[PDB]
Design an enzyme around this catalytic site. Sequence first.
Site, PDB file in Angstrom:
ATOM      1  N   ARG A   1       4.121  17.721 -47.641  1.00 22.09           N
ATOM      2  CA  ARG A   1       3.201  18.095 -48.702  1.00 22.09           C
ATOM      3  C   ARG A   1       2.089  17.078 -48.861  1.00 22.09           C
ATOM      4  O   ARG A   1       0.921  17.442 -48.903  1.00 22.09           O
ATOM      5  CB  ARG A   1       3.951  18.254 -50.027  1.00 22.09           C
ATOM      6  CG  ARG A   1       4.551  16.980 -50.581  1.00 22.09           C
ATOM      7  CD  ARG A   1       5.345  17.264 -51.845  1.00 22.09           C
ATOM      8  NE  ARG A   1       5.991  16.062 -52.352  1.00 22.09           N
ATOM      9  CZ  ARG A   1       5.388  15.139 -53.091  1.00 22.09           C
ATOM     10  NH1 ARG A   1       4.114  15.281 -53.434  1.00 22.09           N
ATOM     11  NH2 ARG A   1       6.052  14.054 -53.453  1.00 22.09           N
TER      12      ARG A   1
ATOM     13  N   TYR B   1      16.214  13.533 -50.845  1.00 21.17           N
ATOM     14  CA  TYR B   1      16.321  13.766 -49.404  1.00 21.17           C
ATOM     15  C   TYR B   1      17.675  14.145 -48.791  1.00 21.17           C
ATOM     16  O   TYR B   1      18.155  15.260 -48.957  1.00 21.17           O
ATOM     17  CB  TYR B   1      15.780  12.537 -48.665  1.00 21.17           C
ATOM     18  CG  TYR B   1      14.280  12.377 -48.770  1.00 21.17           C
ATOM     19  CD1 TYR B   1      13.426  13.316 -48.196  1.00 21.17           C
ATOM     20  CD2 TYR B   1      13.716  11.288 -49.434  1.00 21.17           C
ATOM     21  CE1 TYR B   1      12.054  13.176 -48.277  1.00 21.17           C
ATOM     22  CE2 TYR B   1      12.344  11.141 -49.520  1.00 21.17           C
ATOM     23  CZ  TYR B   1      11.518  12.090 -48.938  1.00 21.17           C
ATOM     24  OH  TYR B   1      10.151  11.961 -49.004  1.00 21.17           O
TER      25      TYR B   1
ATOM     26  N   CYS C   1       8.415  13.946 -49.961  1.00 20.76           N
ATOM     27  CA  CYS C   1       7.093  14.150 -49.342  1.00 20.76           C
ATOM     28  C   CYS C   1       7.288  15.009 -48.112  1.00 20.76           C
ATOM     29  O   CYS C   1       6.601  16.017 -47.953  1.00 20.76           O
ATOM     30  CB  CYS C   1       6.440  12.824 -48.951  1.00 20.76           C
ATOM     31  SG  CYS C   1       5.725  11.972 -50.350  1.00 20.76           S
TER      32      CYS C   1
ATOM     33  N   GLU D   1      16.395   4.175 -42.196  1.00 14.00           N
ATOM     34  CA  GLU D   1      16.210   5.174 -43.236  1.00 14.00           C
ATOM     35  C   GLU D   1      16.611   6.560 -42.750  1.00 14.00           C
ATOM     36  O   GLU D   1      17.302   7.283 -43.460  1.00 14.00           O
ATOM     37  CB  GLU D   1      14.761   5.216 -43.705  1.00 14.00           C
ATOM     38  CG  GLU D   1      14.542   6.177 -44.862  1.00 14.00           C
ATOM     39  CD  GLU D   1      13.114   6.681 -44.928  1.00 14.00           C
ATOM     40  OE1 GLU D   1      12.623   7.168 -43.881  1.00 14.00           O
ATOM     41  OE2 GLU D   1      12.493   6.601 -46.013  1.00 14.00           O
TER      42      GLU D   1
ATOM     43  N   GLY E   1       0.848  -1.171   0.000  1.00 15.04           N
ATOM     44  CA  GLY E   1       0.000   0.000   0.000  1.00 15.04           C
ATOM     45  C   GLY E   1       0.889   1.227   0.000  1.00 15.04           C
ATOM     46  O   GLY E   1       0.453   2.314  -0.376  1.00 15.04           O
TER      47      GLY E   1
ATOM     48  N   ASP F   1       0.141   9.826 -46.447  1.00  9.50           N
ATOM     49  CA  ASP F   1      -0.755   8.688 -46.379  1.00  9.50           C
ATOM     50  C   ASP F   1      -0.958   8.421 -44.892  1.00  9.50           C
ATOM     51  O   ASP F   1       0.011   8.157 -44.181  1.00  9.50           O
ATOM     52  CB  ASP F   1      -0.094   7.484 -47.031  1.00  9.50           C
ATOM     53  CG  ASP F   1      -0.704   6.181 -46.582  1.00  9.50           C
ATOM     54  OD1 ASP F   1      -0.062   5.124 -46.768  1.00  9.50           O
ATOM     55  OD2 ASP F   1      -1.834   6.214 -46.044  1.00  9.50           O
TER      56      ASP F   1
ATOM     57  N   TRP G   1      12.176   1.629 -50.475  1.00 12.33           N
ATOM     58  CA  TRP G   1      12.558   2.298 -51.718  1.00 12.33           C
ATOM     59  C   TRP G   1      12.745   1.387 -52.924  1.00 12.33           C
ATOM     60  O   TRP G   1      13.175   1.841 -53.984  1.00 12.33           O
ATOM     61  CB  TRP G   1      13.852   3.084 -51.537  1.00 12.33           C
ATOM     62  CG  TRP G   1      13.705   4.341 -50.786  1.00 12.33           C
ATOM     63  CD1 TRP G   1      13.929   4.535 -49.456  1.00 12.33           C
ATOM     64  CD2 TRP G   1      13.323   5.607 -51.318  1.00 12.33           C
ATOM     65  NE1 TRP G   1      13.716   5.848 -49.127  1.00 12.33           N
ATOM     66  CE2 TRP G   1      13.342   6.530 -50.254  1.00 12.33           C
ATOM     67  CE3 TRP G   1      12.964   6.054 -52.594  1.00 12.33           C
ATOM     68  CZ2 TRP G   1      13.018   7.875 -50.426  1.00 12.33           C
ATOM     69  CZ3 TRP G   1      12.640   7.391 -52.763  1.00 12.33           C
ATOM     70  CH2 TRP G   1      12.671   8.285 -51.685  1.00 12.33           C
TER      71      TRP G   1
HETATM   72  N1  LIG Z   1      -4.229  -8.438  -2.270  1.00 13.48           N
HETATM   73  C1  LIG Z   1      -3.245  -7.955  -3.076  1.00 13.48           C
HETATM   74  O1  LIG Z   1      -3.445  -7.999  -4.304  1.00 13.48           O
HETATM   75  C2  LIG Z   1      -2.023  -7.420  -2.493  1.00 13.48           C
HETATM   76  C3  LIG Z   1      -1.877  -7.413  -1.061  1.00 13.48           C
HETATM   77  N2  LIG Z   1      -0.679  -6.893  -0.551  1.00 13.48           N
HETATM   78  C4  LIG Z   1      -0.607  -6.927   0.918  1.00 13.48           C
HETATM   79  O2  LIG Z   1      -0.232  -5.639   1.396  1.00 13.48           O
HETATM   80  C5  LIG Z   1       0.500  -5.745   2.599  1.00 13.48           C
HETATM   81  C6  LIG Z   1       1.857  -5.003   2.335  1.00 13.48           C
HETATM   82  O3  LIG Z   1       1.625  -3.536   2.330  1.00 13.48           O
HETATM   83  P1  LIG Z   1       2.509  -2.541   3.236  1.00 13.48           P
HETATM   84  O4  LIG Z   1       2.359  -2.748   4.679  1.00 13.48           O
HETATM   85  O5  LIG Z   1       2.368  -1.197   2.625  1.00 13.48           O
HETATM   86  O6  LIG Z   1       3.984  -3.072   2.851  1.00 13.48           O
HETATM   87  P2  LIG Z   1       4.967  -3.183   1.609  1.00 13.48           P
HETATM   88  O7  LIG Z   1       4.869  -4.598   1.134  1.00 13.48           O
HETATM   89  O8  LIG Z   1       4.871  -2.072   0.717  1.00 13.48           O
HETATM   90  O9  LIG Z   1       6.441  -3.041   2.330  1.00 13.48           O
HETATM   91  C7  LIG Z   1       6.754  -1.817   2.992  1.00 13.48           C
HETATM   92  C8  LIG Z   1       8.207  -1.987   3.369  1.00 13.48           C
HETATM   93  O10 LIG Z   1       8.961  -1.907   2.125  1.00 13.48           O
HETATM   94  C9  LIG Z   1      10.057  -1.036   2.420  1.00 13.48           C
HETATM   95  N3  LIG Z   1       9.968   0.313   1.806  1.00 13.48           N
HETATM   96  C10 LIG Z   1       8.838   0.974   1.247  1.00 13.48           C
HETATM   97  N4  LIG Z   1       9.158   2.171   0.809  1.00 13.48           N
HETATM   98  C11 LIG Z   1      10.490   2.330   1.061  1.00 13.48           C
HETATM   99  C12 LIG Z   1      11.410   3.372   0.839  1.00 13.48           C
HETATM  100  N5  LIG Z   1      10.999   4.494   0.267  1.00 13.48           N
HETATM  101  N6  LIG Z   1      12.716   3.223   1.214  1.00 13.48           N
HETATM  102  C13 LIG Z   1      13.121   2.071   1.799  1.00 13.48           C
HETATM  103  N7  LIG Z   1      12.324   1.018   2.061  1.00 13.48           N
HETATM  104  C14 LIG Z   1      11.004   1.213   1.662  1.00 13.48           C
HETATM  105  C15 LIG Z   1      10.246  -1.030   3.914  1.00 13.48           C
HETATM  106  O11 LIG Z   1      10.981  -2.152   4.394  1.00 13.48           O
HETATM  107  P3  LIG Z   1      11.894  -2.149   5.630  1.00 13.48           P
HETATM  108  O12 LIG Z   1      11.029  -1.609   6.685  1.00 13.48           O
HETATM  109  O13 LIG Z   1      12.357  -3.529   5.882  1.00 13.48           O
HETATM  110  O14 LIG Z   1      13.079  -1.221   5.373  1.00 13.48           O
HETATM  111  C16 LIG Z   1       8.821  -0.976   4.237  1.00 13.48           C
HETATM  112  O15 LIG Z   1       8.442  -0.976   5.626  1.00 13.48           O
HETATM  113  C17 LIG Z   1       0.733  -7.267   2.747  1.00 13.48           C
HETATM  114  O16 LIG Z   1      -0.122  -7.812   3.744  1.00 13.48           O
HETATM  115  C18 LIG Z   1       0.560  -7.886   1.387  1.00 13.48           C
HETATM  116  O17 LIG Z   1       0.064  -9.208   1.513  1.00 13.48           O
HETATM  117  C19 LIG Z   1       0.352  -6.390  -1.390  1.00 13.48           C
HETATM  118  C20 LIG Z   1       0.190  -6.402  -2.766  1.00 13.48           C
HETATM  119  C21 LIG Z   1      -0.975  -6.908  -3.288  1.00 13.48           C
END
Ligand SMILES: NC(=O)C1=CN([C@@H]2O[C@H](COP(=O)(O)OP(=O)(O)OC[C@H]3O[C@@H](n4cnc5c(N)ncnc54)[C@H](OP(=O)(O)O)[C@@H]3O)[C@@H](O)[C@H]2O)C=CC1
Lengths: 515, 518
Positions: free
Chosen positions: A421, A341, A401, A293, A155, A424, A315
């Site tokens: 000019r 050309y 062209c 070309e 997320g 197509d 060509w």
């Molecule tokens: N149902 C679906 O289709 C999907 C579900 N999900 C679910 O979403 C949840 C995961 O989401 P969320 O909690 O946001 O976690 P993420 O999977 O995005 O992981 C976040 C972690 O990634 C790292 N991170 C993110 N941004 C940075 C940055 N700018 N620099 C350095 N490290 C970074 C960090 O790791 P660290 O802290 O180790 O440094 C951070 O805490 C899960 O439960 C997964 O199952 C995910 C995708 C799809």
Amino acid sequence: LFKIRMPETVAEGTRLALRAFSLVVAVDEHGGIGDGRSIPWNVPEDMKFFRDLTTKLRGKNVKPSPAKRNAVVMGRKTWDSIPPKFRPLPGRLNVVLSSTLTTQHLLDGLPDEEKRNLHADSIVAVNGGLEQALRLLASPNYTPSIETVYCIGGGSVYAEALRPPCVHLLQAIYRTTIRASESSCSVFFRVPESGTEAAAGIEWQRETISEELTSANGNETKYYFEKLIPRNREEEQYLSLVDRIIREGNVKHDRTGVGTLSIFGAQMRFSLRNNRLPLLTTKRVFWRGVCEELLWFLRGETYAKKLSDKGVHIWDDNGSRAFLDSRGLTEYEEMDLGPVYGFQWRHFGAAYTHHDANYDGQGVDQIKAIVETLKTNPDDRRMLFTAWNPSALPRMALPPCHLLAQFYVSNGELSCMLYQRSCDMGLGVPFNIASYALLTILIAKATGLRPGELVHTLGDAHVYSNHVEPCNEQLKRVPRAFPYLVFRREREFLEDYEEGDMEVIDYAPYPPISM
Amino acid sequence: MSLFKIRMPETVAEGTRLALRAFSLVVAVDEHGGIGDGRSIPWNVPEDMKFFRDLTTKLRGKNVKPSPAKRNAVVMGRKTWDSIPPKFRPLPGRLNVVLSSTLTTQHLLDGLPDEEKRNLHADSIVAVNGGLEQALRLLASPNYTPSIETVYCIGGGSVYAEALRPPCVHLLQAIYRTTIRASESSCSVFFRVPESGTEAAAGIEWQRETISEELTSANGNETKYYFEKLIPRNREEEQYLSLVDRIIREGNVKHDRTGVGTLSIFGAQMRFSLRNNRLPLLTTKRVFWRGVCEELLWFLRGETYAKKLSDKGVHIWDDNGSRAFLDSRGLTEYEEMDLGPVYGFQWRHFGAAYTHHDANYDGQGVDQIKAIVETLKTNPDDRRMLFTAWNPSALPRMALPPCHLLAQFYVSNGELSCMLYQRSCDMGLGVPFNIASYALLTILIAKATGLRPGELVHTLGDAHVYSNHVEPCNEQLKRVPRAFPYLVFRREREFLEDYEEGDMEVIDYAPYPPISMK
Ligand SMILES: NC(=O)C1=CN([C@@H]2O[C@H](COP(=O)(O)OP(=O)(O)OC[C@H]3O[C@@H](n4cnc5c(N)ncnc54)[C@H](OP(=O)(O)O)[C@@H]3O)[C@@H](O)[C@H]2O)C=CC1
Ligand SMILES: NC(=O)C1=CN([C@@H]2O[C@H](COP(=O)(O)OP(=O)(O)OC[C@H]3O[C@@H](n4cnc5c(N)ncnc54)[C@H](OP(=O)(O)O)[C@@H]3O)[C@@H](O)[C@H]2O)C=CC1
Ligand SMILES: Nc1nc(N)c2c(OCCCOc3cccc(F)c3)cccc2n1
Ligand SMILES: Nc1nc(N)c2c(OCCCOc3cccc(F)c3)cccc2n1
């Protein structure tokens, strides 16, 4: 001495900042994605879609390899979220984001050491966010080796992918909606609304939405798919002009019985900014013939056999012994087009005898001159070259062209205006838009400027008579997101650039017009 | 010469003849839109009565009283004529044109009080046995055009009705309506200006140029009335007004070596209709057409010696034809005012070698115009009919490069269209001039090839606005475009090169007054 020597900035001009990418996600009826460490529900169909999408390559023949494979970028937690068995995800370069775990770390959490090596080229972590990974994916190692990048999770990684500067590089959004009421998910997934400030100018639109489906997992789960894309106004210009021609054009018939619907006067605009290459997506363009070309034009070449020995046959017909003689160019060897050309570009008005003769120094080299002015007085208003030479027309296999082009400079970006000019709409125009986007980019690299826009002015715009049905099929397709042009390597002289030096990436055209 | 010159086809006068003369309409209504109950104007308002007088009598540019050689004209149904008190008949200072299927010019004359009156108004009274359309047609004659400056339809429900519908409506330069609060005066005939978008508006978009505050008449009852000047929205000219505006508000600022600064964009394209003698002479700022016509004719003749222009009171080439400017280009051998192989020389002698302006160049170089002319006449669908003056070879030899360096002709339904390519476009003084040049050439080339003028597409390259022009080009923006004028030829020629500026005249050109900034 005769060739245009590329500047010391050459590469800094078109260096690819961030590799483009698509995004894959699953959401519930409430827009929710999941809570911290899990996706409670599981729909086999969706799971499969994911597997196939992120892993297969367009080339319906190649299997992922370390030379050509897709990439999957994900946040650490999401990686943690993968069954230690399914990790790394097979057939894809796994890019995990984390400010703690390192390439060696992720790798060691894997059971059988057999794969702790077979999966050494399969896992890579970045100490940053999507932007930094998109940035590490833009380097020579990964681009163009990695065909398509798929931001698969977090997320937090999603929020970034949906906001500048990343969104401007988001080629498409695939969203599966699992209608399985669940509050597990906390973070909602929102595609920025059209016209709002979060949309940073991008208009997200559905390319395809499926009908309600039910998974065969004994739960009767209701779900459906969605592929959203960023509306490409640019390509629309083209399609509009076409649709107008077909609908309101003037039907004129040749002396050879050829039919054409046409209109007179029109103008379109394209952004050559940030590595963007305007290759239409509603019908694949033969980029290689374009590059081979154009490059041919730049060298003032006049011998067509050269593009011919390279697969580019554009060509052949006008280089036939028959045709040439029907022009009274009886002394011209087959395939010697005359001073067409490029010859007028580099040698305006020079006396032409044969393509063999050396022409260095001969005539007016409009291009060498446009390059030199661009670098000393970019606000000049006479930076245009022409191949339309009334005096030399008769000695040409054919009149040009695309006969004129002017350059303009503002805020370090080079813009180009093309004058065609006759054009197509079915095969020429898309090809030419390519040609001049490529010419403008090089001229920029050669002048220490950054590509800007290409303005296309059409004179006689016409859709051939037996294109109407096909062009109608095409007019149905919604334009996708244009690809990007990178440069594997450079050259010391403009004239020395080969087609193998520039690679087109993320070009995802639609299928051949089902005719 | 002759074969060197371009012979005009027999139909040389067929495609440019003016069919219907343009006109304005002046009328008065009551709050409900009634003009009158087909018997009379139940209400006479002094202030208005004066407006009608001055409006239909006065000429453009004061200090000029009407005369038989220069007067306005009014068109009216027979009844309206009948309704003018026989004594103040005919309206003085104007050509009184009357529509009547029963009265002849003579009959109308016999209707005046005595033979004296009938001999003083002989040439001021004419009868047309037809409708407004026949009156506009007759007025379109060499006798009244351009002689008569402005035609005003002064009345008749029958006439207003005709005036406000095709084909005459397409020739209604402006509507002057006076609304009076006529109490209980429930007349019958209603004057209604077609609304935008409706079928009846025939594609026209009538907007108010001006409207007056509710005014009180110093007559008897103090009847309240007001004024309106409606005109047909001219998108075509707004094209230019929008672009100018977009340049001021968004263009890029630049200052060259001279230190001359300008704002600008890159890449634009406008469209102008040349159908039916229409001439796209901009109305928000008077265009120097005598000069435009002179220089275009200069271009076609293949001239290169600026002097022939300054001897005719045209100095648009004095700065670039001088002694210093000439030298500053390394053109020391050139006589003063001898610009070299510029424009027209390339038009008629592309590639030819130059020496001096008085040299003989017949048969030398490619005569592009002569070629386009012959092709238009035999293979009008050819996709290669374009002349160019952008010749890299001779460029260094010219006093300076061409600004309008390329033109391409197109044919459709016997209508000749023309596209132009201009690299440097000065929106304030340059662009309006060029839109007139290529409008004139298209018209001339159509004449020379048995074709009717079509459209003019103007492609701009580097379109700018000088910083010095920014404030005024901002006042002009305020101005709402008016209908364009027309071009009529008073005579023809054996060859295209023979036309002189006097063989033609612009009529019904009503440009807004000079700008209020020196
Ligand atoms: N149902 C679906 O289709 C999907 C579900 N999900 C679910 O979403 C949840 C995961 O989401 P969320 O909690 O946001 O976690 P993420 O999977 O995005 O992981 C976040 C972690 O990634 C790292 N991170 C993110 N941004 C940075 C940055 N700018 N620099 C350095 N490290 C970074 C960090 O790791 P660290 O802290 O180790 O440094 C951070 O805490 C899960 O439960 C997964 O199952 C995910 C995708 C799809
Ligand atoms: N308030 C105002 O601003 C104005 C008010 N009025 C009022 O309106 C009334 C006049 O209106 P209305 O009755 O419509 O009369 P008109 O003034 O329109 O006169 C109609 C007459 O004009 C002639 N005519 C019109 N069309 C044609 C044609 N196509 N071919 C030949 N002849 C044609 C005919 O002459 P013929 O009879 O010989 O066949 C016809 O009968 C009057 O009472 C006048 O005072 C008039 C103008 C302005
Ligand atoms: N449309 C879509 N997009 C995803 N991005 C996705 C997903 O992504 C999460 C990344 C972890 O991947 C896996 C892969 C296989 C098994 C597993 F449990 C998690 C997991 C399940 C369904 C999914 N469906
Ligand atoms: N706004 C307006 N419009 C007219 N069209 C008009 C008019 O129309 C002229 C046609 C009849 O003309 C006369 C002229 C003098 C006396 C008379 F009774 C009628 C006469 C007087 C005022 C007028 N006022």
